[PDB]
Amino acid sequence: SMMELRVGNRYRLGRKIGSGSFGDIYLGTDIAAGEEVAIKLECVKTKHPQLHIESKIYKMMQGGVGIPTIRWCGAEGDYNVMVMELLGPSLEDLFNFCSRKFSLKTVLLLADQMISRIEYIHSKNFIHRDVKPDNFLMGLGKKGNLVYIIDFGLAKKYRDARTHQHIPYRENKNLTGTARYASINTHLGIEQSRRDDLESLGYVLMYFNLGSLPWQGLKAATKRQKYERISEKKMSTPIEVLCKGYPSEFATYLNFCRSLRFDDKPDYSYLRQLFRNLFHRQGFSYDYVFDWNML
Template sequence: MKYVKRTMCIRTQMASGTDSLSDPAVLANQRVGNSIFTVGYYVTGGSFGSLYIGTNTETGEKVAIKVERADIDKPQLPLEYGFYKTLGNYMIFIPKIHYFGPCKNYSALVMDLLGPSLLKMNQICGGHFGLVTTTKLMIQILNIFEYVHSQGIIYRDVKPDNFLFGQPNTPKWATVHMIDLGFCKRYINEDNRHISYVEGKGVTGTARYISVNNHVGRELSRRDDLEAILYMIIFLHKGQLPWQGLNVADLRERTKQIGIIKMTTSSKELCSNMPIEYENFLELVKKIRFNERPPYRQMMNQFRYVLFRMGITADDNYYDWDQSHQPRHENKRL
C-alpha cells in the first residue's frame, strides 16, 4: 500500500502573552459562571488548554474547569463545548457541562469532575486487564460510540487517557465516560449527507491507536473510530502493541513506521490469545465501507457472548481492581 505525502495534524498552540497557562497561579481563586464556581488548583496543561479543579460554591462539590486563552487565533474550546452540547447532558457517559464562558482573559468550560482514566486503572492493575474487564470495557465503549456516531459525530482521538470512570464510591464509578472532544468532527453535513471521501489528509490523533486509513491520509469515518478502539483495548489487555518501542526519533517517520507495521500485522497475530470475537471484530471493521453504518449491536452482542461463555453478565460492576472479585473466570474455556 502506497503512502501519501501529507502534513501532520498538530493541535493549536497557545498564544503568547503576559498571562501564561503554564503558571498554575494565573486563575487561582477566580470566579466563573455568575460567581457560582471558583477556580482551584492547577492539574495539567498543554497546547489544547489547561485543566483546573474547581468548586461549586453553592453545593461544595468539586468540578473540572478547562480553560483556554480567549485571544488565540484558532480557539478550540468553543468547538469542544459545541460537541458537548450536541451530545447532551442526559447521557450518563458524557460529563455534564455546568458553564461555558469568560474567565479573565480566558474561556472556561466547567464540567463534572470524573474519576481515574482507563490508563490510570490499567497501571494500577500492573499494565494488564484480564479478559473479563477487557470485554466489559469493549461493550461499554462500543455503546458510547454507537450514540456519538448517531449524533453525526466522529471522535478521532481514541486513547486510554480520554476515557474516565466516575468518582469512586458513587453510582457512576463503574461507568466509562468520554472526555476531550477537541478532535471531534461532524461526518454528516448541514444538508444531512455524509462527508465525501478524500485522500491526502493529515494524520489526526495518537499514532499508537489510529486506524490504517488515518495513517495513509484517507478521510476518517465511523469505521476508523472502531478500529482505534480495538487497538486501545488490545493495549490495555496485553500491555503492548507490536508497533510500540520503535527507535525512531523523527515524529513523522515514526508515525509512518507504525502504520507500516499495522498494515503488515495480521488480525490473527494481533489478537492472539484472545477470544476469536476480537479477531472477527477487526476483520469486520476493515470491511466496512467509508459511509456505511457499523453493526454496533451485533458487535456488542458478540462480546456479551464472550462473557456468557465465562459465566458472567456484562452489567455487573466487578473489575480487575475489585479485590473481592478476582478474575477467576479467566480459567474457563473460551
Template sequence: MPPKGPGRSKLPVPLPKDMILKDTEGKTWRLGSQIGQGGFGLIYLASPQTQVPVEDDAVHVIKVEYLENGPLFSELKFYQRAAKQEHIRKWMNLKKIRCLGIPVFWGSGLAEYKGKSYRFMVMERLGQDLQRIFEDCGSRFKKEIVLQLGARMLDTLEYIHENEYVHGDIKAANLLLGYSNPHEVYLADYGLSYRYCPNGNHKQYQENPRKGHNGTIEFTSIDAHKGVAPSRRGDLEILGYCMLQWLCGKLPWEQNLKDPVAVQTAKTKLMDELPDSVLRWDPPGSSCSEIAKFLASVSALAYAEKPKYGVLKQILLDGLESSGMRYDGPLEFSTAGSTQNHRAAKSRVRLPKPPPKAAQQRGKKPEGEEPACPNQVCVGLPGTELLGEEKPKARSRRAPQAQLQQVRL
C-alpha cells in the same frame, strides 16, 4: 472558528483561586484548587455555591484556556450540539441502557484576567483515568474487563456517531471512572472530535498526506495515517487497538512509535491478515478471538458505511457470557498476569470510594441500589451555539465502497 496565532495551544496564566466566573446563562461559579492541566489548558475544582470556598470533594470542574486556543472550542461545540442531557436520556431509554459514558456539561463562558481573554467550560468531575489503572494492573487487564469496557464504549460511540460526530482519540488516558460511582466509565476529551456528517452529508474520502498521522500514534486509525477526515469506522478501529493492548499488554508496532510510516505499515498488515494476525497475540491463559472478530467486522466497513453496532456489541457480549458477568456490572480491576516489566500478581486494584458529601450533592439512591448515572439525573445548562465550522482533523484509509449514509440528529 477561533483565530489562529502565536498563542495557539499555549498554557494560560493560572486564574486565582476563589475567582467568580459567570457562564452564558448567567450562572456563577467559584474556582477552587487547580487539579490538572493538559495541552489545552488548566482544570480547577468549582462550585455554584459562590459564598463559600470550594471544597476538595467538589463535584464540578472548570476547564480553562486562552480564547484564541482551539481544543476547548471544539469540545464545547460537541457538547452544545450533540450532548444535551434530554437527548441522552431519550437515547438511553430507547436503547434500554443504564448509563451512557458521556460527561455532563453544565455550562460555558468567557472571562478576563490581567488583560487576557479566557474561555471556560463547566463539567461534572470525573475520577481516575484508565491509563493509570492499567499501569497499576501490570499493563494488562483481564479479559472480562476488556470486554466490559469495549461494550460500554460501543454504546457511547453509537450515540456520538448518530449525532454526527466522531471522537478521534479513544485511549485509556481519555477513559475516566465516575467520581461518585467508580463502576461507571466515561469517554472524555473531545478536543479532536469532528463533525463527520454535518446535516446528514458524510464527508468525502480524500487522502491528504500533509495531515497524515494525526491523533495518538499507538491507536490512531489507518485512515488517520493517510490524512483522511475521521469517520465512524476509524473510531471503531481505534477501540479495537485499545482492547488488543489492554488484553495483551502491548501492540505489534509499539517498538516503532517514532516512525509513523512503520506504524501505519504494521497496522495495515494486521488488518489485512485478520483474524490470524490478532489470534497469534493470544495472552497466556486467554484468547483474543473476540477482538479478532471485532476488528474483522470493522475492517469490512466502507468509509461512509454505518456500522452494525448491535452485531459488534454481541461479539463482545458472547465473550462475557461464559464468565457470568454483565457488561454493565461492577468493574473489578485486577492484574491479569505478568509482562516484561511487571511480576505476575493476584492483587486487586482498589477503586476510590465515592466521597460521602459528593454523593449527597449528586443524589443518593436508596440503600441496596446502584448509584445512578449522572446522565439520568442531571440536566446540563444549555449553551449558546458557537459559530463557525471546524476544519477536519486528519484521518485515513480504504476508498469508499458504498453509498453515503444519512445520520439522524
C-alpha cells in the same frame, strides 16, 4: 505564569491534573454551587482557539448515557474556560493501577460500554477521532460502574444534521489524534468515518489485553516521526499476528471494522454481541465487578 486561586469570581482552581486536546485540565470548585468540578483552560492568544467549538459539541451531546454535563464556557482574562462535571479515574489510570493487567472479564465489560459510547457520538453526527484509554473515565458514587467518554476537541461532523447526508469520501485536512491508536486509513491521510473510531477502539482493547502494542514508540520523537514509524509497523502487522493468543472475537472485531465501507452504518449490536457471547461462554457474571474493585 501562576494560576490564581480563582478563575474569575465563580471558580476555585485547584491542581492541574492532566491535559486534553488543546488545553490543560484542572480540578476546581463552582463556589456559588458548592460543587467540585473539572475545568479545561485554553490560552486566548493561541493561533486557532477551539474551546468554544468543543463546548458547543458537548452541549449537543447532552443527555447521552456516559456524557459528562457541561456547566459553562466562556472567557476569563487570559483564558477561555470550560467547566465540566467531575468524574472518576481514566481507564489509563486504572490500567496502571492494575499493573497493566486487565482480566478478560474486565476487558469485555469495558468493551460493551465503549462500543455504546462511540455509537452514541455517531448518532449525534460526529466522529470522535481520538479514541484512547485516557478519554474514557469511570463515574462517581452510584455511577462508579459507568464508563464515560470525554474530549470533543478533535471531533468532526460526518453527516449533515438535517439531511443525514454522509460527507464525501476525501483526503483528511483536520488535525489528528494519537498515532498509537489511529486507524490505518488515518495513517493513509484519509478522512475518518464511523468505521475508524471503531477500529481505533479495537486497538485500545488489544492494548488492554497485551499491556502494550507492538508499534509502541519513543516519546522523544516528533509527531511526524511517530506517524511514520507506527504507520510502517501497524501496516506490516496482520490482525491475526496482533491478536494471537487471545479469544478470536478480538480479531473478528478488528477485521469487521476494517472491512466497513467509508459510509457504512456499522452493526454496533453485532460487535457488542461478539463480546457478550464470549462473556457467557466463559461463565462470567455481569456484576459490575471490575479488576480495580478487587484492589
